[PDB]
Design a protein around this ligand. Structure first.
Ligand code: ZN
Lengths: 142, 101, 140, 128
RNA sequence: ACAGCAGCAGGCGCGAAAAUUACCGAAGCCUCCAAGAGGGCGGUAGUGAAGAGACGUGAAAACAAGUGUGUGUAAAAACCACAUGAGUAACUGGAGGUCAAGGCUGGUGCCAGCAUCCGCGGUAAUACCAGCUCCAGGAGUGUCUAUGAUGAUUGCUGCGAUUAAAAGGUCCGUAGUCGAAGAACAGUACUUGUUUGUAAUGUGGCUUAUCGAGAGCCGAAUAGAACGAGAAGAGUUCAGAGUAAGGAGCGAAGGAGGGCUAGAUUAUUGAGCAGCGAGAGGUGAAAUUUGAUGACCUGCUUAGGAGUAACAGAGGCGAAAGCGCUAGUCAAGAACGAAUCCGAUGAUCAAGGACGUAGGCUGGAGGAUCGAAGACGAUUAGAGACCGUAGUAGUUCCAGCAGUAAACGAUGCCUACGCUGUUGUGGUUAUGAGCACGGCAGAAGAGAAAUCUAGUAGGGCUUUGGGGAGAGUACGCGCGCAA
RNA sequence: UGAGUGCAGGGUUCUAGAUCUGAUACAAGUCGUAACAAGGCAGCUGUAGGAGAACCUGUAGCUGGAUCA
């Protein structure tokens, strides 16, 4: 089940059985690889890179053509971010809640949501600072 | 021992409900438990409609009705005989009552 | 607590549970040496100081014959019961008597006698059964 | 998550009680395969197919009329060859038939093979 | 001046509790300068129903225990051999049920007593006190006291927690215990071989004291350690692998979920003014009470502070406590659709932290209605109460403290396996159906039943009960302004 | 190296104490009758006042209720 609440949803998307090569498409390998690195330098998250490749350029799951994963390609090109993108999105939501509570101090429901959010941050931090993906003395922006 | 499967009330999937006040004694009772009664009563009694037909100035007249929903606590409903004690197999039968006049 | 490497947790839990047993608790945490006959001794010597009688509990109707004994080993004074038909007549004030338990798990009242916890066994070094049935005589 | 070897047992026990002849079992591990293959050697189950779905794994099996019951033991106790008969007498209905399965350096073996090979191991499960 | 019996005998005390101020150039050993000397160490008997063997108390013809010789020993006694006399030898607890065995005869009359427990006796006692017959074990049988079993009433094997005793008010969270599939790798646990490691006791045997305990000889052995071996499970790693495991993100939509800003239709009270001219209120029936200083009722004006009727439900939302007028605004969450991204990030939780109806407390704002306390009127033997009149703290808001509820579906949280019909709510749809959250009615199993959040089961983790009472009380400690 | 012994304190276990206040047993004493029937005002849980005494009254909750409607 869900980690912070009583949810038991089941909405996911199916991974294919085999992957082949997308011969119906209208670009070369080298063009697709160029499209990714452009979208990266403009500052898009890698989950959004995937959405665009599927929706506009017509490639499912973005790996059948490249034999390599999106984040690994960005490390080969040297475009790696300073913080992993998951930990980064958790710090953003915390900041937002603290900015709301700063002006609407009375909101007990928002107070409740903040302590849940903050717990999730440190649980994620401890993962990354074991795999050597963050400096040992990293601390939140707060 | 537990006498009724529904604890004598219609609350499910909720914590708490609004209270209402008994018509006969003003006691507080939860809305989902209170005994309810509907009334639709003519302003004019049946024993006067034959005089109304000669009293009115209009070519035809429709008598105005008055509408009410009444609420009762258990003690009052039993005492006023809106409901009665029933046998262990009868307790389970559920049927809508008539609107009063 | 049922894991393969859980022995330490399991042991500490199960030890703590046993204090719910009255038997284990008294031995561990009560005063087990307060009594004239019990954990301490099977029999007790003492001197007779007063003769006494007590009513039986309902629904019975009787006067039971009892004796006030000063116990040499503790300097407490206790009540004891005198068993046999004419038994009270075999005892004088200032006699020495040996005293015995009634046979319950803890020191508890037996039958219809309220609040008495011991009985007389011997008077002046001789068996009370022999005295009452006139098989032997007082030392004099 | 449930233990995979426990899940296997409850799935076949319930279906047998409901008088079905075949079932699909939804999460499979290496020792689950070896357990089923043991029940086939002794004629408790008849036919086995394995589905390679890339999501864990699943099996489809045909039950015989000979199977009364099976079960897993948790945790998996270590036993000397001196100990196994104690567990045999606790789990099985009769001295004449049924199998207690033990994992060893020589694979899964039954309580008779333990005497033949002269080896203890870890207790895994039983069927009769 | 001398002296120290937890050496051997012995005495006094203390206790419910324990032997002779005995013989010893012999047996087993130790000590010396020794073909010898020393030893209360050790051996021999005496005393005692702590324990353990074998046998007497007659047979149908014909029976212990005595005695004398020899033996035996260091000297003895007992034991054994032969020979003499003979004719001796059972008690303890019971007889209503459990529990084997008498309604037998005489006394006693809720007395005297008996009885582990249940129970007997008030003049017809199979239960008391005795006589007589039976029963049980028998050189033995009763009682008291610790303990093991009884006992699945301590539960690893193996108990319980809807109503019998028993799931923390809700979340977060550390220590602790527990943790995918696929392909490979390594040997410290794990299992096993060989070798060590046990005198007595115990275990499997055989041999000699008339027999039986006893004595003598044999074989194997626990835990622990030394060196090898096997690799299923456990462990470590990898990525042309991507959970009906989790987190991040995208699209369209739904809800009394929460904070803030600005508005609203009535209603209940209070004042002003106008009309009218005698009662209003309240109850089962009445009295307190209010009205010619004009009530009540009907108009028009105003002033406040609460609340959101009917629609409205076995409907919805929230972690729980809880949430119902209309617009605008600010954050985050649940579910659904689908070829998005990362890759073990996870389950449960002592300590520690955050929320928690109502009533209560500290300070400010305010004060319509209702109303603890207090005061009256009735009713009653008496009402201090129930009923009526009136009336204060509180009831509302902001900033905090507090920490309890029949905080209940009296049913912990994850995760499984499971029959049918019917009815809802929100999305999606090959229009056949699904996914999440519910209600209802049977069935089969289950259970002491009532009934079923209770079916199946050695899955994981925490809380928790052990006949009534005393007691959720005393002492100590921690929090709180107090309660 | 130190036995013994001064003087202050602590830590443990027992015991005295005017007086006050619990509990338990009281054959059957005095005053009421609070609970069990709609027990004569339906009962019970929390909290706050009050009262010869059981208890009574306000406020929120529960059915184990006298209603599965
Ligand atoms: Zn009413």
């Amino acid at each position: 089940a869900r980690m912070y609440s009583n949810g038991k949803g089941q909405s996911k998307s199916v991974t294919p059985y085999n992957l082949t090569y997308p011969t119906y498409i209208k670009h070369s390998k080298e063009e697709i690889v160029d499209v990714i690195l452009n979208l990266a330098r403009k500052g898009t998250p890698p989950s959004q890179i995937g959405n665009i490749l599927r929706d506009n350029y017509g490639v499912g799951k973005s790996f059948a053509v490249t034999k390599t994963k999106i984040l690994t390609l960005l490390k080969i090109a040297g475009l790696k971010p300073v913080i992993p993108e998951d930990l980064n999105n958790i710090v953003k939501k915390c900041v937002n809640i603290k900015a709301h509570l700063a002006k609407y101090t009375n909101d007990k429901s928002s107070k409740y949501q903040l302590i849940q959010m903050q717990s999730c941050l440190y649980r994620v931090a401890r993962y990354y600072k074991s795999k050597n993906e963050l400096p040992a003395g990293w601390k939140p922006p707060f | 021992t537990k006498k009724r499967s529904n604890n004598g009330r219609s609350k499910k999937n909720r914590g708490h409900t609004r209270c209402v006040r008994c018509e006969h004694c003003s006691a507080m009772v939860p809305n989902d438990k209170a005994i309810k009664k509907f009334v639709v009563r003519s302003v004019i009694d049946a024993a006067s409609l034959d005089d109304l037909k000669i009293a009115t100035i209009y070519e035809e007249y429709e008598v105005p009705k008055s509408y009410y929903k009444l609420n009762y606590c258990v003690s009052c409903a039993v005492h006023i005989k809106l409901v009665r004690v029933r046998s262990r197999w009868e307790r389970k039968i559920r049927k809508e009552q008539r609107v009063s006049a | 607590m049922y894991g393969l490497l859980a022995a330490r947790n399991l042991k500490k839990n199960r030890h703590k549970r046993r204090y719910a047993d009255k038997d284990f608790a008294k031995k561990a945490r009560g005063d087990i040496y307060q009594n004239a006959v019990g954990y301490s001794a099977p029999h007790a010597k003492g001197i007779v100081t007063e003769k006494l009688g007590v009513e039986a509990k309902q629904p019975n109707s009787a006067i039971r014959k009892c004796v006030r004994v000063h116990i040499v080993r503790l300097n407490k004074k206790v009540i004891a019961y005198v068993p046999h038909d004419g038994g009270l007549n075999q005892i004088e004030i200032n006699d020495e008597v040996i005293v015995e338990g009634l046979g319950k798990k803890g020191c508890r009242s037996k039958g219809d006698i309220p609040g008495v916890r011991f009985r007389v066994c011997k008077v002046q070094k001789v068996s009370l059964k022999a005295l009452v049935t006139k098989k032997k005589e007082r030392p004099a | 998550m449930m233990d995979k070897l426990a899940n296997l047992c409850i799935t076949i026990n319930n279906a047998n009680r409901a008088q079905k002849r075949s079932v699909v079992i939804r999460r499979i591990s290496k020792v689950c395969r070896l357990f089923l293959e043991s029940m086939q050697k002794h004629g408790y189950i008849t036919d086995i197919v394995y589905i390679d779905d890339h999501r864990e794994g699943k099996a489809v099996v045909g039950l015989s009329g000979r199977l009364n019951r099976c079960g897993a033991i948790c945790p998996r106790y270590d036993v000397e060859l001196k100990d196994v008969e104690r567990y045999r007498a606790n789990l099985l209905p009769s001295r004449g038939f049924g199998h207690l399965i033990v994992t060893s350096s020589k694979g899964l073996i039954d309580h008779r093979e333990c005497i033949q090979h002269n080896t203890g191991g870890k207790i895994l499960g039983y069927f009769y």
